[PDB]
């Protein structure tokens, strides 16, 4: 379909390899915060529509203008929160057994695929809170080693690649 759909299927295949091989714990929160901002903006919109449908306009001008200004403020805050964390970060996960100690094991993923490019970038991040250490892993590969001639993206060669990447992250961890 599109190279963005290729990136989406690649991230989904990485999550499928993670679920088939090591089974770590998913997270949420950024999409939940975006849905919270959109739910509050829809609350402003529904209150504005009901209050405009039940009351005439020259007696309802100023607080409706305040609702328009509030929509401007909420969309600006949504744009700033987009610029905070929605640049490259995709997947947030906790690892196995964070019990008995401080919450360690922040496993963070980011992807990069430029417009009209044959190169892919994957950045892994392992944050441990006992020693307060972050570990970055920049993986710049060429996409031409995985595709085929007429529509068969080989996963049987991509899965040992993710195995070697997880071995590298295991060396970085231990």
């Amino acid at each position: 379909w599109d190279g963005s759909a290729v990136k989406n299927s690649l991230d989904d295949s990485a999550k499928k390899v993670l679920l088939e091989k090591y089974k770590y714990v998913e997270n949420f929160g950024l999409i939940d915060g975006r849905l919270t901002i959109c739910t509050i903006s829809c609350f402003f919109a529904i209150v504005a529509l009901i209050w405009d449908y039940m009351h005439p306009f020259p007696e309802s001008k100023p607080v409706l203008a305040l609702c328009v200004i509030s929509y401007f403020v909420m969309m600006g805050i949504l744009t700033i929160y987009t610029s905070y964390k929605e640049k490259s970060i995709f997947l947030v996960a906790h690892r196995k057994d964070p019990t008995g100690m401080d919450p360690d094991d922040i496993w963070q993923l980011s992807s990069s695929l430029k417009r009209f490019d044959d190169k892919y970038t994957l950045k892994l991040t392992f944050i441990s809170g006992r020693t307060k250490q972050q570990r970055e892993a920049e993986f710049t590969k060429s996409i031409a080693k995985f595709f085929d001639h007429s529509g068969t993206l080989v996963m049987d060669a991509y899965e040992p690649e993710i195995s070697r990447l997880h071995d590298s992250l295991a060396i970085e961890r231990k």
Binding site: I31, R34, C38, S41, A45
Partner: protein
């Protein structure tokens, strides 16, 4: 099922509905009057405004409306906003201004509500004084109104 597709559909619906109603309400607040973005559906002003033209309105803007301006009122017998042009004018020094209007390609002054007991039309049926127009978008509006 997967709830993420439902939240993404709510996200896209929220984007399009909030954007459209925000543009509509922001324009009708920043004008000052109720200011509907109207579309000419009558061929009375055909050398001036052809069939299918968009008109955006402005406020009275602390200005008594003299002669030589187009006004948009509402016909209750058909419930349709109709635009005409002011010709004559009358003044009273208590905040009361009466006016006479006319349409092009016509011969008879429009009766409307009053016929002979008072002046010809009423000063409170007008929505506002017109500001500007688009000749291209109104044809697209008529095409979209061909399939309601």
């Amino acid at each position: 099922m997967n709830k993420r597709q439902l939240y993404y559909q709510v996200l896209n619906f929220a984007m399009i509905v909030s954007s459209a109603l925000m543009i509509w309400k922001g324009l009708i607040v920043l004008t000052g009057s109720e200011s509907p973005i109207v579309v000419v559906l009558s061929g009375s002003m055909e050398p001036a405004f052809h069939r299918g033209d968009l008109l955006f309105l402005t406020n009275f803007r602390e200005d008594p409306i003299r002669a030589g301006e187009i006004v948009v009122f509402k016909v209750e017998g058909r419930d349709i906003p109709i635009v005409h042009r002011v010709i004559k004018v009358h003044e009273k020094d208590n905040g009361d201004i009466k006016f006479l209007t006319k349409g092009d390609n016509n011969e008879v002054d429009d009766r409307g509500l009053y016929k002979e007991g008072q002046n010809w039309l009423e000063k409170k049926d007008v929505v506002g004084r017109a500001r500007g127009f688009l000749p291209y978008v109104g044809m697209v509006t008529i095409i979209m109104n061909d399939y309601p």
